[PDB]
C-alpha cells in the first residue's frame, strides 16, 4: 500500500480533486432567489419551437416564409403537401430547432417526440387532411390510398385547429416518415387569394435520455 502508485503524478483533464483557494477570506456574497431555474437540460428540450418546413433557396434566407407552407383551392385531392425523414440531429428541417439543437451535444439518444400541426387559415375555411405515419424501415406512401392503409389520423379542419401526433421509437437511412395529404380541397368563403397556411412545431415528449458529451458541429473555431 503506497501513495506513489502508477498514475499518481499527472494532470488528467476531467478528473476532480480539491484545490487550495486563492482567497480563503473573501468569498461572501449571499445568494438570493431568482425566478426560473434550470437544473437539467431536458427542461428546455420539452419546450415547443416552430420548425421550418419550407426550404427553397431564399425562402430560408428571408425565413418568414420558411415556417409556413402554402395551400390552395387549385390543388386536387390526393396530392401530398410536405413530408420529412423524421430523424432529428441529421435532417435539416428540425435539427436547428430548440429541441434539436440539444441533441447535437450528445451521441446516442432515445425517447419519443411529438409534432403538432396548427392551421392558421381563415375561420370560414374548412377542409380535411389525412395525416400519415410510416413505421421505420418502410418507404413513404406513394398514393393517398397507400397512406390511408397505413397509420393515419383524419384531421378535420373546421372542428380542430390543431392535432398532436406522438411518435414513439426514434433514436440514432431507415426511420419513419410523416406525410400530409389532401383528402378534400379547401373550401373558401369567397377569398380571392386561396392562400392558407399551416405551421408545425416540435418538442421532445416525456422521458428522454442522452449519453456521452461531444462538441457541436455548427460553430467553427475562433476568428478574433
Amino acid at each position: 500500500p503506497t501513495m506513489n502508485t502508477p498514475g499518481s503524478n499527472q494532470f488528467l483533464t476531467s478528473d476532480d480533486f480539491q484545490s487550495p483557494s486563492a482567497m480563503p477570506q473573501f468569498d461572501v456574497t449571499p445568494e438570493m432567489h431568482i425566478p426560473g431555474e434550470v437544473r437539467n437540460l431536458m427542461e428546455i428540450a420539452e419546450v415547443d419551437s416552430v420548425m421550418p418546413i419550407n426550404n427553397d433557396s431564399a425562402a430560408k434566407v428571408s425565413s418568414m416564409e420558411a415556417y409556413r407552407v402554402e395551400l390552395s383551392t387549385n390543388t386536387n385531392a390526393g396530392t401530398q403537401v410536405f413530408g420529412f425523414q423524421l430523424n432529428p440531429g441529421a435532417e435539416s428541417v428540425m435539427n436547428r430547432t430548440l429541441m434539436g439543437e440539444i441533441l447535437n451535444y450528445y451521441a446516442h439518444w432515445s425517447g419519443s417526440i411529438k409534432i403538432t400541426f396548427v392551421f392558421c387559415g381563415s375561420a370560414m375555411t374548412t377542409g380535411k387532411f389525412l395525416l400519415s405515419y410510416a413505421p421505420p424501415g418502410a418507404g413513404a406512401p406513394k398514393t393517398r390510398k397507400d397512406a390511408m392503409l397505413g397509420t393515419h389520423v383524419v384531421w378535420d379542419v373546421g372542428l380542430q385547429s390543431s392535432c398532436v401526433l406522438c411518435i414513439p421509437w426514434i433514436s440514432q437511412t431507415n426511420a419513419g416518415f410523416v406525410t400530409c395529404w389532401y383528402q378534400t380541397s379547401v373550401v373558401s368563403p369567397a377569398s380571392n387569394q386561396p392562400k392558407c397556411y399551416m405551421m408545425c412545431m416540435v418538442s421532445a415528449c416525456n422521458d428522454f435520455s442522452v449519453r456521452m458529451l461531444r462538441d457541436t458541429k455548427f460553430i467553427e473555431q475562433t476568428s478574433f
Binding site: T13, A22, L41, P52, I53, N54, N55, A66, R211, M212
Partner: protein, 220 residues
C-alpha cells in the same frame, strides 16, 4: 435505461476543462520588451466555450485555473522558478518586470518550480452582484450615453507571469497554457442558442445568416 438520466444535469453540461489561452515570456532584464506577460480572465475568447455559457442569462460559480508550463532554451543553469500572480479586480498592476506590484501583500501568488505537478488554485465567486450577467441591456453612465453592454458587469481579475531567477547567459523562453473549468454552477433563465458566428469579443454584433439548409423540395 431503467431510471432518470443524469448526464444532462447542469453540472455535467458544464464543468469540463478547456484550453483558453497560452502566452510566452522569457528571461531577461526589465529593459527587454517581453519578459513578463499577462492574461485577462474572460470566457468569451474561445468560441466553443462561449456557446455553452450563452445558454443561460445568469450564472454563479467558483472556478479552477490550472496552468501547465513548459520551457525550452535556444541556441548557444539551475532549475527555474515561475511566479503566477492573481490580481483581484481593482488592485494594482505591474507595468514592468520590477515593481512593488509583485511585492504587494494583497495579491495571491504561486511560486512553482519545474518537475512538479502543475500549479492550480481556485478563485471563489467574486462580484458584488449575485450572479454574473451574460447579457446586459444598459449603459455605464446614469444617463444613457455610456458604453452599451458588458460594462462593470462580467469583470474578473487577471494573471501575470514572470521568472523569479536573475537573468543569466542564454535566454530561456517559457510557454504557459491555461486550462479553466467552472464548478458548482447554478443557472437561471435559459436562452435560445446562438446562430450566427461571433465577431467582436465584447459585443453581441452579428452578420445575418440563413436559418437552415436548403432541401431539394418539400414533398417526399
Amino acid at each position: 435505461n431503467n431510471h432518470v438520466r443524469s448526464e444532462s444535469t447542469i453540472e455535467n453540461f458544464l464543468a469540463r476543462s478547456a484550453c483558453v489561452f497560452y502566452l510566452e515570456y522569457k528571461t531577461g532584464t526589465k529593459e527587454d520588451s517581453n519578459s513578463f506577460n499577462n492574461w485577462v480572465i474572460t470566457t468569451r475568447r474561445v468560441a466553443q466555450l462561449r456557446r455553452k455559457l450563452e445558454m443561460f442569462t445568469y450564472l454563479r460559480f467558483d472556478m479552477e485555473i490550472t496552468v501547465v508550463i513548459t520551457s525550452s532554451q535556444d541556441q548557444s543553469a539551475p532549475v527555474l522558478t515561475h511566479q503566477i500572480m492573481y490580481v483581484p479586480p481593482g488592485g494594482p498592476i505591474p507595468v514592468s518586470v520590477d515593481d512593488y506590484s509583485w511585492q504587494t501583500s494583497t495579491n495571491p501568488s504561486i511560486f512553482w518550480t519545474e518537475g512538479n505537478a502543475p500549479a492550480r488554485m481556485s478563485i471563489p465567486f467574486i462580484s458584488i452582484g449575485n450572479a454574473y450577467s451574460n447579457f446586459y441591456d444598459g449603459w455605464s453612465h446614469f444617463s444613457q450615453a455610456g458604453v452599451y453592454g458588458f460594462t462593470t458587469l462580467n469583470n474578473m481579475g487577471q494573471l501575470f507571469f514572470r521568472h523569479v531567477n536573475k537573468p543569466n547567459p542564454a535566454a530561456i523562453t517559457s510557454v504557459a497554457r491555461i486550462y479553466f473549468k467552472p464548478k458548482h454552477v447554478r443557472a437561471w433563465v435559459p436562452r435560445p442558442p446562438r446562430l450566427c458566428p461571433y465577431i467582436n469579443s465584447t459585443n453581441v454584433n452579428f452578420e445575418p445568416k440563413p436559418v437552415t439548409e436548403v432541401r431539394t423540395n418539400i414533398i417526399t
